[PDB]
Enzyme design. Structure first.
Site, PDB file in Angstrom:
ATOM      1  N   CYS A 112       0.827  -1.213   0.000  1.00 14.54           N
ATOM      2  CA  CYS A 112       0.000   0.000   0.000  1.00 14.54           C
ATOM      3  C   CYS A 112       0.860   1.262   0.000  1.00 14.54           C
ATOM      4  CB  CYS A 112      -0.951   0.042   1.193  1.00 14.54           C
ATOM      5  SG  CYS A 112      -1.918   1.543   1.189  1.00 14.54           S
ATOM      6  N   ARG A 115       0.027   4.323   2.960  1.00 16.50           N
ATOM      7  CA  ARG A 115       0.159   3.951   4.359  1.00 16.50           C
ATOM      8  C   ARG A 115       0.450   5.097   5.315  1.00 16.50           C
ATOM      9  NH1 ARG A 115       4.181  -0.858   4.520  1.00 16.50           N
ATOM     10  NH2 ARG A 115       4.703  -0.336   2.360  1.00 16.50           N
ATOM     11  N   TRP A 284      -8.740   5.737  -1.037  1.00 11.84           N
ATOM     12  CA  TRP A 284      -9.176   6.563  -2.156  1.00 11.84           C
ATOM     13  C   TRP A 284      -8.164   6.352  -3.261  1.00 11.84           C
ATOM     14  CZ3 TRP A 284      -8.019   9.626   2.414  1.00 11.84           C
ATOM     15  CH2 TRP A 284      -6.694  10.101   2.428  1.00 11.84           C
ATOM     16  N   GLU A 289      -4.094   4.560 -11.254  1.00 14.75           N
ATOM     17  CA  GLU A 289      -4.739   3.255 -11.106  1.00 14.75           C
ATOM     18  C   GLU A 289      -5.842   3.103 -12.137  1.00 14.75           C
ATOM     19  OE1 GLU A 289      -5.580   1.636  -7.212  1.00 14.75           O
ATOM     20  OE2 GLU A 289      -5.098   3.612  -6.407  1.00 14.75           O
TER      21      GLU A 289
HETATM   22  C1  HEM Z   1      -4.826   6.669   2.178  1.00 13.47           C
HETATM   23  C2  HEM Z   1      -5.823   5.963   1.246  1.00 13.47           C
HETATM   24  C3  HEM Z   1      -5.166   4.860   0.444  1.00 13.47           C
HETATM   25  C4  HEM Z   1      -4.529   4.938  -0.761  1.00 13.47           C
HETATM   26  C5  HEM Z   1      -4.289   6.131  -1.648  1.00 13.47           C
HETATM   27  C6  HEM Z   1      -4.109   3.590  -1.096  1.00 13.47           C
HETATM   28  C7  HEM Z   1      -3.442   3.264  -2.274  1.00 13.47           C
HETATM   29  C8  HEM Z   1      -3.047   1.993  -2.637  1.00 13.47           C
HETATM   30  C9  HEM Z   1      -2.395   1.646  -3.906  1.00 13.47           C
HETATM   31  C10 HEM Z   1      -2.068   2.624  -4.976  1.00 13.47           C
HETATM   32  C11 HEM Z   1      -2.192   0.285  -3.871  1.00 13.47           C
HETATM   33  C12 HEM Z   1      -1.582  -0.606  -4.960  1.00 13.47           C
HETATM   34  C13 HEM Z   1      -2.565  -0.819  -6.204  1.00 13.47           C
HETATM   35  C14 HEM Z   1      -3.296  -2.047  -6.336  1.00 13.47           C
HETATM   36  O1  HEM Z   1      -3.783  -2.551  -5.243  1.00 13.47           O
HETATM   37  O2  HEM Z   1      -3.492  -2.626  -7.439  1.00 13.47           O
HETATM   38  C15 HEM Z   1      -2.693  -0.175  -2.594  1.00 13.47           C
HETATM   39  C16 HEM Z   1      -2.652  -1.486  -2.147  1.00 13.47           C
HETATM   40  C17 HEM Z   1      -3.153  -1.962  -0.931  1.00 13.47           C
HETATM   41  N1  HEM Z   1      -3.733  -1.193   0.015  1.00 13.47           N
HETATM   42 FE1  HEM Z   1      -4.085   0.743  -0.050  1.00 13.47          FE
HETATM   43  N2  HEM Z   1      -4.438   2.696  -0.097  1.00 13.47           N
HETATM   44  C18 HEM Z   1      -5.124   3.452   0.841  1.00 13.47           C
HETATM   45  C19 HEM Z   1      -5.676   2.957   2.017  1.00 13.47           C
HETATM   46  C20 HEM Z   1      -5.669   1.654   2.429  1.00 13.47           C
HETATM   47  C21 HEM Z   1      -6.301   1.160   3.657  1.00 13.47           C
HETATM   48  C22 HEM Z   1      -7.081   2.049   4.597  1.00 13.47           C
HETATM   49  C23 HEM Z   1      -6.025  -0.173   3.687  1.00 13.47           C
HETATM   50  C24 HEM Z   1      -6.421  -1.259   4.722  1.00 13.47           C
HETATM   51  C25 HEM Z   1      -7.443  -0.842   5.823  1.00 13.47           C
HETATM   52  C26 HEM Z   1      -5.261  -0.481   2.506  1.00 13.47           C
HETATM   53  C27 HEM Z   1      -4.792  -1.743   2.185  1.00 13.47           C
HETATM   54  C28 HEM Z   1      -4.104  -2.087   1.019  1.00 13.47           C
HETATM   55  C29 HEM Z   1      -3.665  -3.451   0.708  1.00 13.47           C
HETATM   56  C30 HEM Z   1      -3.887  -4.640   1.595  1.00 13.47           C
HETATM   57  C31 HEM Z   1      -3.099  -3.365  -0.498  1.00 13.47           C
HETATM   58  C32 HEM Z   1      -2.530  -4.439  -1.352  1.00 13.47           C
HETATM   59  C33 HEM Z   1      -3.773  -5.044  -2.190  1.00 13.47           C
HETATM   60  C34 HEM Z   1      -3.434  -6.094  -3.032  1.00 13.47           C
HETATM   61  O3  HEM Z   1      -2.641  -6.985  -2.659  1.00 13.47           O
HETATM   62  O4  HEM Z   1      -3.941  -6.152  -4.190  1.00 13.47           O
HETATM   63  N3  HEM Z   1      -5.034   0.625   1.725  1.00 13.47           N
HETATM   64  N4  HEM Z   1      -3.218   0.866  -1.849  1.00 13.47           N
HETATM   65  C1  LIG Z   2      -7.778  -0.153  -0.040  1.00 18.31           C
HETATM   66  O1  LIG Z   2      -7.481   1.059  -0.804  1.00 18.31           O
HETATM   67  C2  LIG Z   2      -7.184   1.078  -2.115  1.00 18.31           C
HETATM   68  C3  LIG Z   2      -6.934   2.308  -2.775  1.00 18.31           C
HETATM   69  C4  LIG Z   2      -6.632   2.274  -4.110  1.00 18.31           C
HETATM   70  N1  LIG Z   2      -6.577   1.118  -4.814  1.00 18.31           N
HETATM   71  C5  LIG Z   2      -6.832  -0.111  -4.211  1.00 18.31           C
HETATM   72  C6  LIG Z   2      -6.749  -1.468  -4.987  1.00 18.31           C
HETATM   73  C7  LIG Z   2      -7.808  -2.401  -4.605  1.00 18.31           C
HETATM   74  C8  LIG Z   2      -8.125  -3.037  -5.942  1.00 18.31           C
HETATM   75  N2  LIG Z   2      -7.718  -4.210  -6.326  1.00 18.31           N
HETATM   76  C9  LIG Z   2      -8.139  -4.465  -7.620  1.00 18.31           C
HETATM   77  C10 LIG Z   2      -8.022  -5.529  -8.570  1.00 18.31           C
HETATM   78  C11 LIG Z   2      -8.605  -5.414  -9.840  1.00 18.31           C
HETATM   79  C12 LIG Z   2      -9.313  -4.242 -10.187  1.00 18.31           C
HETATM   80  N3  LIG Z   2      -9.419  -3.263  -9.315  1.00 18.31           N
HETATM   81  C13 LIG Z   2      -8.869  -3.292  -8.039  1.00 18.31           C
HETATM   82  N4  LIG Z   2      -8.821  -2.421  -6.931  1.00 18.31           N
HETATM   83  C14 LIG Z   2      -7.127  -0.139  -2.859  1.00 18.31           C
END
Ligand code: HEM
Ligand SMILES: COc1ccnc(CCc2nc3cccnc3[nH]2)c1
Ligand code: HEM
Ligand SMILES: COc1ccnc(CCc2nc3cccnc3[nH]2)c1
Ligand SMILES: C[C@H](O)[C@H](O)[C@H]1CNc2nc(N)[nH]c(=O)c2N1
Ligand SMILES: C[C@H](O)[C@H](O)[C@H]1CNc2nc(N)[nH]c(=O)c2N1
Lengths: 414, 414
Positions: A112, A115, A284, A289
């Site tokens: 993430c 974070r 958000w 993305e």
């Molecule tokens: C500050 C707001 C947040 C932003 C801008 C954000 C942004 C992102 C981005 C850009 C990714 C990688 C893109 C993708 O998943 O394909 C990601 C992955 C992830 N985020 Fe966030 N995130 C946010 C909040 C959170 C919160 C609040 C949680 C958990 C309560 C979280 C949990 C995760 C996890 C677990 C992944 C990895 C998902 C995966 O394995 O596909 N994120 N986040």
């Molecule tokens: C938890 O906060 C965020 C913020 C921004 N981005 C994400 C990615 C989650 C997600 N996984 C995906 C897999 C396929 C298509 N869309 C998808 N979105 C999570």
């Protein structure tokens, strides 16, 4: 024997034999869903010999958190947990601990990028839930809470913890809000080519395919342990953004939009030896993305082609770098559109500067910060970002958010 | 105790403590020069118990290469190698084997994107060399061969193999042709801020700093084992490209250029238990290397700023994505300039489609292909490339090209 490797673009697969002839120096990393990052199914409960230690650990980490400890509450709580376990063969977290657990787990997410927000999180305690209709209801409140009319708010709603394992709560959708993809008669593909498989599943479970380029798929919840029940999301609850470019006005003609709410619905929260197989969470979007991944990938909408056409660019010479020019403009649109329609968003550049800040506070803080460079580095404009030139260690701590075997592949239909 | 982590941009460093609290699932990967990828110094020869097996192996792989084997030559060669080793405590490769070894090692480079060329390689046998002046001479022929008036040709010149280890051949430059960087009185930094350290070294060894933005640093060769001797590269031998944009004509005003020849000079070739600590090799540039990395990085020229200014773009709003627009144009320049001035080059997009082709032929071929996704995925326009959505295993085979401890850090000055 051999390792399978997928190419999410062409969806092609290869079997690696060579690694066997490796040297005494087989790194995975480049893998989407590795098993080292997953926490699958169960049949029986969680062996106390295991639960008990981890349970203790967490509790120590928890009380070892607050400034000037509560030594007595620490011991007291310790005792109570121990007592509770040896009485029911498991234990319940207080809400304050769950909250701690949810923020920590997030904080500990190697993939993430935002974070730095880890402390700002809304925790919805849905652990009492019991039926599909109750799930469906809580998912709604969350969605509505998080969407907050565009001014997005990160939240999480923690359903019932895994007990035996034959009584698991599981949202079958990869995400809370996500368009559906059908494969048109003429061989084409409307909507999100990505969700072809799941869309079918939705039909197979009685969902009425409004065959369209932007159909928001139905919630497919399974509770306690029963089969999944199909539910449609209240069209009012899903806030979207219509894509329009601050220059090329032919852009909206493209008929493009996207949901404002990114919520991951199939991850598992592990904390103190306990694990919750259902606990959607949202943050958000980070421009790139939607603009890069969702619109351009060949396995999604794949719009890159004509977006360059309408820019005059020679769409026959790779060397011309039109793609680079196209994508750029697409992203300027999304950032514009969101910006304009007052829906919170983050351009990949600022995102990185803030993560870097974060990473730094994170080392001075607890001397460390788990990161998966691969995932963290924006899909475009990489070396134009700080994080690109930032070496980073990727490791699994706890609490943590694990992927988990796709439910249909592991169910008991009656 | 803890792991050091560098940030090549700000050159800052952090010590990771957290990983220790890792779980029973510490991956490096995100590391530039890991020790698992290096082959440092020596004092004594190479224990026969080791040499002999590897020696055999290689030879089997070698003869097990050609269609319809030469069973007798295979055995004969086998014998001779064995005999030679137990007579001198080492062994010489035939030229045909070295050639095989050079192409294989290249083919086995997890971080090279053009490996699809692996079969096209020019091998210069410099193993007889003996003095610095002879090195300097061979480096010149190679440079001249490879530059081939712009129509570049990949080559390699294999100097003397490591014997005891106190008699090593080592080019002290990171690369064959690379501008120097001085730190101007006014605190600024002319030239390649990257080579600050080495440029000083060049001075300290008697090099005359022509204090400029594009000074091609002097060869710093050490032969047999003596101290390094400074040599200047024949200005005629270095072919460069003057950067000019096919539109923004204010671009050349920028006073920009870059050498056409990418040759890595400090890597070590390991094959059949033998190792050559000096063996420069060259291919040809992939646009984004010059346009993105060399010109834009904050630790290099850092031109991104004013290139956007001269585009009107608001250089005060990250969210405006000017950087994305700037870089794009810079790359169109380089591709143009090179193209125009007939100097071979490859745009990152075609590069990837070809590697993918390669990777595929590579699995059908020997069921495998070592790749370091991180390195392989272009520094910009990542997910717009095939390789981005291609899972890949990274492993060390042999032959192979290992990094190796910077010579100054490990020398014996008299
Ligand atoms: C500050 C707001 C947040 C932003 C801008 C954000 C942004 C992102 C981005 C850009 C990714 C990688 C893109 C993708 O998943 O394909 C990601 C992955 C992830 N985020 Fe966030 N995130 C946010 C909040 C959170 C919160 C609040 C949680 C958990 C309560 C979280 C949990 C995760 C996890 C677990 C992944 C990895 C998902 C995966 O394995 O596909 N994120 N986040
Ligand atoms: C938890 O906060 C965020 C913020 C921004 N981005 C994400 C990615 C989650 C997600 N996984 C995906 C897999 C396929 C298509 N869309 C998808 N979105 C999570
Ligand atoms: C077809 C011409 C070639 C092209 C376009 C090419 C391109 C590249 C690129 C883009 C990289 C990564 C960028 C970087 O190093 O910072 C790379 C790395 C590398 N290439 Fe090549 N290459 C070519 C030929 C060769 C040859 C002929 C060899 C060996 C004889 C070679 C050996 C390597 C090695 C060892 C690395 C990794 C270097 C490192 O660790 O920094 N390449 N190449
Ligand atoms: C061997 O064929 C190629 C082709 C294209 N690119 C390279 C990279 C080598 C190299 N390493 C470097 C480190 C710093 C500055 N410039 C550098 N060039 C090598
Ligand atoms: C920290 C990180 O390992 C470093 O910035 C890497 C990332 N990927 C790279 N990829 C290539 N081709 N070349 C590089 O120099 C780098 N730098
Ligand atoms: C094969 C490779 O692991 C895959 O394409 C990864 C690369 N990096 C990524 N990074 C993010 N943020 N999201 C993704 O979906 C991916 N896909």
């Amino acid at each position: 024997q051999y390792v399978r490797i997928k190419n999410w673009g062409s969806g092609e697969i290869l079997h690696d034999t060579l690694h066997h002839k490796a040297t005494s120096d087989s790194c995975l990393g480049s893998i989407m869903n590795p098993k080292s990052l997953t926490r699958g199914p169960r049949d029986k409960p969680t062996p106390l010999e295991e639960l008990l230690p981890h349970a203790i650990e967490f509790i120590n980490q928890y009380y070892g958190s607050f400034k000037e400890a509560k030594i007595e509450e620490h011991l007291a709580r310790l005792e109570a947990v121990t007592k509770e376990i040896e009485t029911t063969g498991t234990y319940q977290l207080t809400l304050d601990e769950l909250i701690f657990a949810t923020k920590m787990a997030w904080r500990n997410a190697p993939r993430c990028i935002g974070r730095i927000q880890w402390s700002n999180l809304q925790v919805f305690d849905a652990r009492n839930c019991s039926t599909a209709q109750e799930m469906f209801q809580h998912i709604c409140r969350h969605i509505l809470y998080a969407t907050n009319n565009g001014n997005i708010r990160s939240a999480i709603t923690v359903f019932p913890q895994r007990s035996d394992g034959k009584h698991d709560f599981r949202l079958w959708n990869s995400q809370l809000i996500r368009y559906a993809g059908y494969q048109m008669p003429d061989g084409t593909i409307r909507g999100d080519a990505a969700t072809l498989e799941f869309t079918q599943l939705c039909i197979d479970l009685g969902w009425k395919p409004r065959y369209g380029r932007f159909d928001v798929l139905p919630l497919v919840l399974q509770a306690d342990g029963q089969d999944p029940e199909v539910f449609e999301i209240p069209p009012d609850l899903v806030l979207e953004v219509t894509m329009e470019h601050p220059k090329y006005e032919w852009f909206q003609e493209l008929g493009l939009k996207w949901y404002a709410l990114p919520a991951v619905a199939n991850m598992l929260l592990e904390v103190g030896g306990l694990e919750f197989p259902a606990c959607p969470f949202n943050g958000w979007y980070m421009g790139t993305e939607i603009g890069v991944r969702d619109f351009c990938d060949t396995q999604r909408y794949n719009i890159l082609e004509e977006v360059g056409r309408r820019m005059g660019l020679e769409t026959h010479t790779l060397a011309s770098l039109w793609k680079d020019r196209a994508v750029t403009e697409i992203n300027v649109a999304v950032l514009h559109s969101f910006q304009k329609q007052n829906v919170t968003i983050m351009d990949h550049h600022t995102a990185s500067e803030s993560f870097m800040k974060h990473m730094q506070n994170e080392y001075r803080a607890r001397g460390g910060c788990p990161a998966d460079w691969i995932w963290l580095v924006p899909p475009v404009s990489g070396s134009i970002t700080p994080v690109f030139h930032q070496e980073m260690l990727n490791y699994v701590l706890s609490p943590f958010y694990y992927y988990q075997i796709e439910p249909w592949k592991t169910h008991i239909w009656q």
